[model samples]
Target: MEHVAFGSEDIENTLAKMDDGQLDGLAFGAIQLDGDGNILQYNAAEGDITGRDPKQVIGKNFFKDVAPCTDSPEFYGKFKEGVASGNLNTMFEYTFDYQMTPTKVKVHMKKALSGDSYWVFVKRV
Candidate 1:
């Protein structure tokens, strides 16, 4: 079967056009955040993978309130640069240790095509 990889640019392009409902139907975790890192949209896949409730996380700071594990120079710092530049698109492997077990995942951060929001794609590894 053919499918988009976790770190594919295709996924980033596709996600830019999808809505909250469409995002939930994705196989990987799809999180949309504003320029400041607040959670704008959290998909069901992300919620399931991270054991978080999507509905409860809206408007929360992703790097602070939701996932403090990314509160470092590598993760949060890169995000800030993206916001400042308005051209963020990077992928890397990361381990999550916030409110969940230590989980390895492929992380993709991209600028949304429609607005100033950004997309963070996570696929468990």
Candidate 2:
């Protein structure tokens, strides 16, 4: 698997202050999910974004709650195909109607060490 070039020290420091930073709105959650769609890690910003607590999100299916729009067969199929093909730089934008207006977001994903796990980063547009 190809590893991203983030420094270990930086990651450690970020994790250490994640919750605090999240509460202060200084950091957003960096989410990781398993092959079956279970959430492995739900960072502070993610929880805040979805209005769900971290404790409520961990081990849950992310597509079911936070980003249910991705649950469509078409989306999941493409996502699975991308992972199997080792696509390193997949990016897509989506709009959701949950917030009474079209909420636009961009998502970037990459395969991780675990076969079915992936790292996803999200940003609002």
**Best lDDT among the predictions, by candidate number:** 1
Q: Tell me the TM-score of each prediction against the true structure.
A: 0.91, 0.63
Q: Candidate 2's error at 27, in angstroms?
A: 4.3
Locate the minimum summed-lDDT window of 10 residues in model 1: 1-10
Q: Give the runs in model 1 whose Cα sits over 4 Å from its true position.
A: 1-5
Candidate 2, 3-78: lDDT as tens digits: 2222232333344333433533433336766766687776565555555676676777766766677777645666
On TM-score, the leading prediction is: 1
Model 2 quality (TM-score): 0.63
Q: For residues 1-125, could you state the per-residue lDDT of candidate 1 as single tens digits?
A: 12456676566666666778777778788899999999989989898888999999998999888898899998999999999988999988999987688899999898888678888989988
